[PDB]
Amino acid sequence: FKPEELRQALMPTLEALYRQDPESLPFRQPVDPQLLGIPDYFDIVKNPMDLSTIKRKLDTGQYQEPWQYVDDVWLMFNNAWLYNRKTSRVYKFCSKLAEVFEQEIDPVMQSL
């Protein structure tokens, strides 16, 4: 896969996530535990991930294969479901994005 081919193919799946508003808002920048006053965040989440990081990796051609992109998107979701309680808005927004991602990534992976 050329990185331009991955970027062209996968960027619309990422755009679909950013289009979810307000559901994407907590995911658009890395969690900042100082600002949010949650010093245990990095005790629980050892490999942080967010949309800005994924976007940067796509933009710069850091993914060799599409599964690596998919793995990072799932890492972001898994981190949020891990840290946050299921009653929280952030966990529910995570679930909403995951549903959108599933629906958009499926045909794309098949094309590829």
Residue 82 within binding range of ligand JHL, rule CB under 6 A: no
- Out of 9, 11, 70, 90, name the contact with ligand JHL by CB under 6 A: 90
Nearer to ligand JHL, 47 or 110 (CB): 47
- Of the candidate residues 54, 83, 97, 101, the single one contacting ligand JHL (CB under 6 A): 83
Quick check: 26 binds ligand JHL (CB under 6 A)?
yes
Phi-psi region of 48 (alpha: psi -120 to 50; beta: other; left: phi over 0): beta
Question: What stretch of H or E contains 73?
Answer: helix 66-83
CB 31 within 8 A of CB 25: no
CB of 49 closer than 8 Å to CB of 82 = no
Q: Does 108 bind ligand JHL (CB under 6 A)?
A: no
The residue type at 2: K
Tokens 């996530």, residue? 17
69 lies in the site for ligand JHL, by CB under 6 A: no
Q: Please identify which residue in 14, 93, 97, 101 interacts with ligand JHL, judged by CB under 6 A.
A: 93
Residue 80 exposed, middle or buried by CB count within 10 Å (0-12, 13-18, 19+):
buried
Q: Minimum distance between the CB of residue 83 and ligand JHL, rounded to whole angstroms?
A: 4
- Binding footprint of ligand JHL on the chain (CB under 6 A): 22, 25-27, 31, 36, 38, 80, 83-84, 89-90, 93
